[PDB]
Amino acid sequence: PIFLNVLEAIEPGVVCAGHDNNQPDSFAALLSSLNELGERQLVHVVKWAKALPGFRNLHVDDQMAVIQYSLMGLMVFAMGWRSFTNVNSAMLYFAPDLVFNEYRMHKSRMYSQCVRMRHLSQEFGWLQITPQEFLCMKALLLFSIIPVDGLKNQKFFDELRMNYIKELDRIIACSRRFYQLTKLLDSVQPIARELHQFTFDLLIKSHMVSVDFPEMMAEIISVQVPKILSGKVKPIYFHT
Ligand SMILES: C[C@](O)(CS(=O)(=O)c1ccc(F)cc1)C(=O)Nc1ccc(C#N)c(C(F)(F)F)c1
């Protein structure tokens, strides 16, 4: 199992947010730590992605664009999984120092999005998703959102996507399963778009609510995320 060996080997380790758990859950505090956490996870997602089989086949500009467009979905999917295996989806395990209970979910003003994510997290139990299926599905999420007008070398992207779908189909090797797993993958995207909308809004009013964005995250939110929210960049859904 060469392919699964590689996915297992490259899987990021623990990322902490740096959150002060002695201060009171304030909107500004929770969100400033979520933004810092997003930057810390991006650093790891970049190194992960670049070690993936075949990823370096993509044009270099397309490499970074694909990582940026898919970052939210990747983080959501992985956090659903951490939640499942750590706390059985009782709470959202964003990081070991940033675990959300209902109260946090309300205080962050992301309650509706958090309930979806915990629902996704519960799915990993309701479907009995294996670690190996989780890893294949996560690698496919990286190849699941692109500009409607295509990437710079779109044939190379299509080839990669095709092969990652095949690897997922093998690991399954039943048609029920593939249907379920592709439906679960599709369910990530509406959640990512809700988070994207929330994040962009927060950046625009960030001065007046006293939330800090790291530079890298501010640049992505102002350059890349609007392309998604304006419909230039859209997810690849399996269904509908
Ligand atoms: C609100 C925000 O802080 C915005 S952000 O992280 O700056 C961000 C900005 C741009 C993106 F394309 C994705 C994420 C955020 O979504 N953070 C965040 C951090 C960690 C994790 C995890 N795990 C998640 C979530 F995906 F799980 F929601 C979300």
From Swiss-Prot:
The modification Phosphotyrosine is found at residue 237. Changing residue 137 to V: In AIS; 25% androgen binding. Changing residue 2 to T: In prostate cancer. Residues 1-240 are annotated as: Interaction with LPXN. Residues 1-240 are annotated as: Interaction with CCAR1. Changing residue 224 to R: In prostate cancer. In the absence of ligand, steroid hormone receptors are thought to be weakly associated with nuclear components; hormone binding greatly increases receptor affinity. The hormone-receptor complex appears to recognize discrete DNA sequences upstream of transcriptional start sites. It is linked to Androgen insensitivity syndrome: An X-linked recessive form of pseudohermaphroditism due end-organ resistance to androgen. Affected males have female external genitalia, female breast development, blind vagina, absent uterus and female adnexa, and abdominal or inguinal testes, despite a normal 46,XY karyotype. Spinal and bulbar muscular atrophy X-linked 1: An X-linked recessive form of spinal muscular atrophy. Spinal muscular atrophy refers to a group of neuromuscular disorders characterized by degeneration of the anterior horn cells of the spinal cord, leading to symmetrical muscle weakness and atrophy. SMAX1 occurs only in men. Age at onset is usually in the third to fifth decade of life, but earlier involvement has been reported. It is characterized by slowly progressive limb and bulbar muscle weakness with fasciculations, muscle atrophy, and gynecomastia. This is Androgen receptor. It comes from Homo sapiens. The lineage of its organism: Eukaryota, Metazoa, Chordata, Craniata, Vertebrata.
